Symmetry: C2
Subunit: 219 residues, 2 copies
């Protein structure tokens, strides 16, 4: 298993909000992952090669193969572990299960949950036009959506602290509903019951783009 990363979080945060990488290009290096759309028009969630666009209004829709991303992380998901929960468990409790099984912070984890969420709180970036506001100011203004008692899918990664420059350090998780019409970037959640699958990943490929914005960015 290889975590295949398109560009750098530092480049995204510097104001490089467009890339030439398509959703079809992402699915060449995985069936599973997360990322951002061109102009920061929400974020993607991918699992079993199905890709959805999650937008700031709490909506999900099928991603089109031609859509472009300035940043993404994909893998061929090959989980080594399965745990079924018949009783409610919080996000932080689920992370403790994963951290106990993969206690080295120096490895990546990929995690998926299929089940019934008591709640799933989401906040997703809206489409930006330059000159760009500070990301923290954009997030202050974005409403949180609260999915209550919903069946759905969670996709996430755990990133080592030794990667903080390059990627989201810690857990990054996205959510989509069973009907695939709702979801977002997760702030917190509680699983009422469902199945966790996850695995460790030892290999990271970083693919730096050629666009002039990336090349001329100050990192």
């Amino acid at each position: 298993s290889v975590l295949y990363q398109t560009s750098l979080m530092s480049a995204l945060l510097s104001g490089v909000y467009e890339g030439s990488t398509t959703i079809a290009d992402l699915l060449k290096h995985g069936d599973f992952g997360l990322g951002t759309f061109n102009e920061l028009d929400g974020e993607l969630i991918a699992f079993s090669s199905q890709v959805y666009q999650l937008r700031a209004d709490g909506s999900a829709r099928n991603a089109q193969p031609e859509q472009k991303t300035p940043f993404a992380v994909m893998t061929w998901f090959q989980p080594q572990y399965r745990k079924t929960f018949d009783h409610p468990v919080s996000r932080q409790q689920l992370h403790e299960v994963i951290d106990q099984q993969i206690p080295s912070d120096n490895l990546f984890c990929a995690l998926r949950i299929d089940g019934h969420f008591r709640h799933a709180h989401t906040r997703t970036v809206p489409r930006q036009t330059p000159p760009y506001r500070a990301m923290t100011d954009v997030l202050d203004d974005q409403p949180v959506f609260r999915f209550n008692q919903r069946e759905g899918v969670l996709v996430g990664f755990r990133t080592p602290q030794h990667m903080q420059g390059i990627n989201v350090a810690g857990y990054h998780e996205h959510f989509i509903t069973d009907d695939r019409k709702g979801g977002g970037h997760l702030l917190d959640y509680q699983l009422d019951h469902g199945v966790l699958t996850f695995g460790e990943i030892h290999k990271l490929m970083i693919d730096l783009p050629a666009d002039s914005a990336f090349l001329q960015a100050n990192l």
Copy 2:
């Protein structure tokens, strides 16, 4: 071209001085590069699939395929640029030639020089036994070797500042003499005349080990 990195500089600097990766394993992902030997017994230089061990006494010898490394960076060298110097040029002048041609700090460069060095100043780490002294104290005690008016080969990489956690930020260059009996990790040099070949690299593969020392290291 892919820069293939075995482990992390942060893990090496934390005191993880042994890996299970062999020189033969390194040559599976390149013909060119740099790295460190188990127990920090000097450093390797590799070019056209020839690999040499450079030790603290200023000696070079052929590396054996079974020797192990805790850290290395290798590539299939595919230079896009060639410049011949008929007149003396310093290391810092040569770097200016490369930086002008590949002005984005956000890309990697691989560089090779074949030619006659006015001087090549080297300092190479000696074999360490735990408990380990601070790397800065070890370097303070290591003599500098000065190669004067020698034909030889330089191998090096330029690492983006956006990678400082993971790798040597900036230029990392090693030197070996024509007779392959002398060389080391370069501090400074001047080329009297010779040929520079170099290329940009957009892709980095980081391969994290499984040994308990790496997994239990604090990074």
